[PDB]
Amino acid sequence: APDAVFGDRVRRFQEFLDTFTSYRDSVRSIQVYNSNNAANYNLNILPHRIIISLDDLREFDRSFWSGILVEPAYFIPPAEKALTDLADSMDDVPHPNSRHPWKLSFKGSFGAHALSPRTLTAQHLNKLVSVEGIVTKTSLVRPKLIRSVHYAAKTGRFHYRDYTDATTTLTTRIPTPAIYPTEDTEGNKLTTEYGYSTFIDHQRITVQEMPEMAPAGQLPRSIDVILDDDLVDKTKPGDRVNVVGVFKSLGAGGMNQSLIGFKTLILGNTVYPLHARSTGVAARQMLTDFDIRNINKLSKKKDIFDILSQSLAPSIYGHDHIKKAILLMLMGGVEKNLENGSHLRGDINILMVGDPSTAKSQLLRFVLNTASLAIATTGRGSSGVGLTAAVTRRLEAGAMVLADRGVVCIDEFDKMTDVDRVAIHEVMEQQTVTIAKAGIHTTLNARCSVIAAANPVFGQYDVNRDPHQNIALPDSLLSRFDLLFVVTDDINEIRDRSISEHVLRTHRYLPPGYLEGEPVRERLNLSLAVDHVFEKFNPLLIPKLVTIPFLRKYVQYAKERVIPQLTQEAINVIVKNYTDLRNDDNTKKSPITARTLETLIRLATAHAKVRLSKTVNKVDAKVAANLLRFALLGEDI
Amino acid sequence: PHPNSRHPWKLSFKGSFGAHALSPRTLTAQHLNKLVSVEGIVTKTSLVRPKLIRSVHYAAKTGRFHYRDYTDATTTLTTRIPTPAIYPTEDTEGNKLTTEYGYSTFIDHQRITVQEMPEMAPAGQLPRSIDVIL
Amino acid sequence: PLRDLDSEHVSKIVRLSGIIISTSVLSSRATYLSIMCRNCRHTTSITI
Ligand SMILES: Nc1ncnc2c1ncn2[C@@H]1O[C@H](COP(=O)(O)OP(=O)(O)O)[C@@H](O)[C@H]1O
Ligand SMILES: [Mg+2]
Ligand SMILES: [Zn+2]
């Protein structure tokens, strides 16, 4: 039976949708997208879901906003009905072959409802809450029968029955346990018609307080979240997540005479995978047309490589070719997948062996902070079980499996066991992890670029000795590292005063919105995995330095929209340089193998990607070989 | 539309009924759930009593008008699930309700008794009667 | 003391010292719940 208050709220939300035109634009775009590939194929179908900004709702109608936040069961169904009515009103051109219920998702500032699994108590029940946590368990995506269609052969007629549970609606119904129809009303045997029955995907994930904010030494708190038909498979275990949903109570909690307390869970409305450092979530960024224009504008510059090289770690003094190599690894080459099935690696590995305090770990931490997807590990702090996969009858991804299509920053690389070393041997060239353990023969993808830091045998790189004795690493392992940089802390007066002036200038830095003696606050930077190009603060005083967010945008653009093709004019340089490096006797820091030809190719491709060029020209090969010759010998030609 | 789906229209039937044109004596149990025309004499006409089919109530604390629809076994030709919804004496959340007569809906109901006509009933035999609900 | 609790302390206020070794997850207990009959629409409230 119709409710006057329900209709009043429906028309109020219709007024809200009319006021903010972005929601008709979103619904219209979704409908035209669905119709266009429906007619095209007689890709994927976008869900009937709209992101609603709670700030705009508060601006429009504060009580509707407070009603949704505090009494969602009475305000969300009317708003969803209004959205569905609006969508069916604009649906003048129906999809080929009210109706099509549209769901709502919420975003914005939740205030006191933005909680965690620890702070989510029983006085938040029946409220729209945003819970931030870590996904620890993801159940199987199971179909749920919401409508069963049967066939009666004697009458030749198709019947159906709709099913309802306590979690499909925000309000409580009268429970109607309608049985599965095994026969008609008048005795005819029914045959279930699979493919005409309706099954809805259902998942139940567990969100636990994030380790970065959970109290140390205390047992963590968890909360159940239920996802239905479009939020399933939106996250994976170990993901940082922000789930917006209604904190519901279900069952009777032992009152109904046939539990210790009422069964509580979150009916998920929105799932946002969050980006935290050293996690398995990549960093999607929004690239406006202005950002792309600036990226192309800077790519037109000749010295853009240098501009990108110095802007990586201005705080670190020097380490300029190391920064060039780090930028090239951030871009990386393009992997080759030949038709027969073979794989050519397109990821660049870097090793930095050096004396104490030459900033190898700060250069690792910077890469961890700025990379799209980076996992930080330490030698012997993570084993092969912790680096590669692990069998739990089920597999748990390790450091280098979560970092697939990403970067692995390994500090204290020398303090790594040989059992880990063999797994690392497999991961670096073939980019795969073969388990073959306890009846689980699986080949996980570990297409990751490894950057590592190491110390010499005696703790100080002796220039009198040779590198092979100063490294104490297997030669086969050192071959996998595309670029091996030996950094030595030479005491020279010019660079001594220059590095000290830099260190002090960096220490004498103030944020734009801070006082002289105000302790700088620090948050954990839980970015959402979806305004000037250059940097005001320049530790060096000189070319221009771009901001780290803009550098990340540039790296993302070049990494996702540029796939350079090798050219003969680059091949001549690459082949000549490889032949010289193989045959010339120079007492190289690292050996020269066919892997050296491919690090030449990969670095040339990466530098071509830096310039946004779709073809690797001669200059790219020359600069790649230049960096390689520096890395092998120390030349400055 | 009239000044100030909707407005359910009822059907009435006329014509030749054949074997369904009966009398209260010949109307047996094998005519049940059939459309029959019965000719007879009206012997009893009950009072035309109103039947509450929708009750409208007012909650003064919230100042809101609520309603409840009522259904019986005789208002539909098909059998429903019986739903004995009680008369709402209070709101869902405890507010006392006041019945709003004149906004509630009452439907006239009569129960007549049709007996075999004396001109066609057998002589000396006790007549047969049938109940009709209008 | 926790070892000195006899049956004479049952249903009485006792002060006892110790160390907490476990804290379970918070569970929801109904302090006021609205109820409605299934084969009716009779609304009632139970207050705890
Ligand atoms: N060349 C350098 N330029 C700037 N800072 C440096 C340099 N070398 C060392 N530092 C400083 O030394 C400190 C320790 O460096 P760290 O990265 O921990 O050294 P290591 O690589 O030996 O572990 C950091 O605060 C870092 O800024
Ligand atoms: Mg270090
Ligand atoms: Zn009842």
Which chain C residues are Cβ-neighbours of A253 within 8 angstroms?
28-30
Q: How far is CA A97 from CA A35, A114, B31, C43, in A?
A: 10, 42, 47, 45
Choose, out of A115, A247, A255, the residue to mutate when testing the contact with C (most C CBs < 10 Å): A255
Q: Are A450 and A429 spatial neighbours (Cβ–Cβ below 8 Å)?
A: no
- What residue type is assigned to position A349 of the chain? N
Read off the tokens for A324.
């060039």
Grouping H, G, I as helix, E, B as strand and the rest as coil, residue A451 is strand
Atom of ligand 1 nearest to the CA of A318: 1
Helix (H) or strand (E) holding C10: none
Q: Are A175 and C38 spatial neighbours (Cβ–Cβ below 8 Å)?
A: yes
Q: Are A354 and A339 spatial neighbours (Cβ–Cβ below 8 Å)?
A: no
Instruction: Reduce the secondary structure of A181-192 to three states and give it as a string.
Output: CCECCCCCEEEE
Instruction: Give burial (CB, 10 Å; 0-12/13-18/19+) of B71.
Output: middle
Q: Is A1 on the interface with B (CB under 8 A)?
A: yes
Instruction: Reduce the secondary structure of A212-232 to three states and give it as a string.
Output: CCCCCCCCCCEEEEEEECCCC
Contact state of C43 with B93 under an 8 Å Cβ cutoff? yes
Phi-psi region of A481 (alpha: psi -120 to 50; beta: other; left: phi over 0): beta
A507 CA to middle of ligand 1, Å? 13
In this complex, which chains have at least 3 CB pairs below 8 Å with chain A? B, C
CATH superfamily of A2-113: mini-chromosome maintenance (MCM) complex, chain A, domain 1 (3.30.1640.10)
Alpha-carbon distance B102 to nearest alpha carbon in chain C (angstroms):
23
Instruction: Give burial (CB, 10 Å; 0-12/13-18/19+) of A584.
Output: exposed
The rounded radius of gyration (Å) of the Cα atoms in chain A is 30
Strand order in the sheet with B111-115: B41-45, B111-115, B129-133
Report residue C39 CA to chain centroid gap: 31
Contact state of B86 with C39 under an 8 Å Cβ cutoff? no
A319 CA to middle of ligand 3, Å? 81
Contact state of C40 with B68 under an 8 Å Cβ cutoff? no
Q: Is A197 marked within a binding site?
A: no
**Phi, psi for residue A432 in degrees, rounded to 5:** -155, 155
Alpha-carbon distance A18 to nearest alpha carbon in chain B (angstroms):
28
Q: For residue A241, what are the contacts with CB-CB under 8 A and spacing of at least 6?
A: A132, A133, A134, A135, A205, A207, A235, A271, A272, A273, A274
Q: Are A319 and A543 spatial neighbours (Cβ–Cβ below 8 Å)?
A: no
Contact state of A122 with C28 under an 8 Å Cβ cutoff? yes
Ligand 1, atom 10: nearest CA belongs to which residue?
A: A359
- What residue type is assigned to position A5 of the chain? V
A309 CA to middle of ligand 2, Å? 21
DSSP conformation class of B96: B
DSSP conformation class of A314: S
Alpha helix stretches (DSSP H) within A197-319: 289-299, 304-310
Q: Is A77 marked within a binding site?
A: no
Give residues (CB < 6 A) around ligand 1: A 316-318, 356-362, 499, 502-503
Read off the tokens for A130.
């945003």
Q: For residue B124, what are the contacts with CB-CB under 8 A and spacing of at least 6?
A: none
Alpha-carbon distance B75 to nearest alpha carbon in chain A (angstroms):
18
Ligand 1, atom 5: nearest CA belongs to which residue?
A: A316
Alpha-carbon distance A174 to nearest alpha carbon in chain C (angstroms):
6
Q: Which DSSP string do the residues of C17-45 spell out, in sequence order?
A: -------PPP-B--SEEEEE-TTS--EEE
The rounded radius of gyration (Å) of the Cα atoms in chain C is 20
What span, in angstroms and rounded, lies between the C-alpha atoms of A69 and A265? 17
Q: Are A111 and A128 spatial neighbours (Cβ–Cβ below 8 Å)?
A: no
Choose, out of B55, B87, B92, the residue to mutate when testing the contact with C (most C CBs < 10 Å): B92
Contact state of C28 with A174 under an 8 Å Cβ cutoff? no
Half-sphere exposure at residue A311, Cβ-oriented, CA atoms within 13 angstroms: 24
Which chain A residues are Cβ-neighbours of B65 within 8 angstroms?
4
Dihedral of CA atoms C37, C38, C41, C43 in degrees, nearest 10, equals 30
Residue of chain A minimizing CA distance to C29: A261
Contact state of A1 with B65 under an 8 Å Cβ cutoff? no
Helix (H) or strand (E) holding A420: helix A418-430
Size of interface B-C (CB pairs under 8 A): 19
Among the listed residues A129, A326, A120, the one whose alpha carbon sits nearest the alpha carbon of residue A223: A120
Q: Is B103 on the interface with A (CB under 8 A)?
A: no
Choose, out of C22, C24, C27, the residue to mutate when testing the contact with A (most A CBs < 10 Å): C27
**Specified resolution (Å):** 3.2
Q: Is A594 on the interface with C (CB under 8 A)?
A: no
Q: Is the dihedral of CA A127, A133, A138, A141 positive or negative?
A: positive
What span, in angstroms and rounded, lies between the C-alpha atoms of B99 and B60? 11
Q: Which DSSP string do the residues of A501-561 spell out, in sequence order?
A: HHHHHHHS---TT--TTPPPP-----EE----SB-S--S------B-HHHHHHHHHHHHHH
Alpha-carbon distance C5 to nearest alpha carbon in chain A (angstroms):
26
Q: Which DSSP string do the residues of A37-101 spell out, in sequence order?
A: HHHHT---PPPSEEEEEHHHHHHH-HHHHHHHHH-HHHHHHHHHHHHHHHHHHH-SSPPP---SP
Contact state of B69 with A4 under an 8 Å Cβ cutoff? no
A204 beta partners: A226
What span, in angstroms and rounded, lies between the C-alpha atoms of A564 and A142? 42
A408 CA to middle of ligand 3, Å? 65
Q: For residue A396, what are the contacts with CB-CB under 8 A and spacing of at least 6?
A: A389, A390
Q: Are A305 and A623 spatial neighbours (Cβ–Cβ below 8 Å)?
A: yes
Of C23, C26, C28, the CB nearest to A253: C28
Among the listed residues A593, A597, A591, A609, the one whose alpha carbon sits nearest the alpha carbon of residue A573: A597
Residue of chain A minimizing CA distance to C23: A219
In angstroms, how far apart are the furthest CA atoms of chain A? Answer: 101
Residue of chain B minimizing CA distance to C41: B85
Phi-psi region of A15 (alpha: psi -120 to 50; beta: other; left: phi over 0): alpha
Instruction: Reduce the secondary structure of B29-86 to three states and give it as a string.
Output: HHHCCCCCEECCEEEEECCCEEEEEEEEEEECCCCEEEEEECCCCCCCCCCCCCCCCC
What span, in angstroms and rounded, lies between the C-alpha atoms of A222 and B71? 48
Among the listed residues A319, A305, A312, the one whose alpha carbon sits nearest the alpha carbon of residue A624: A305
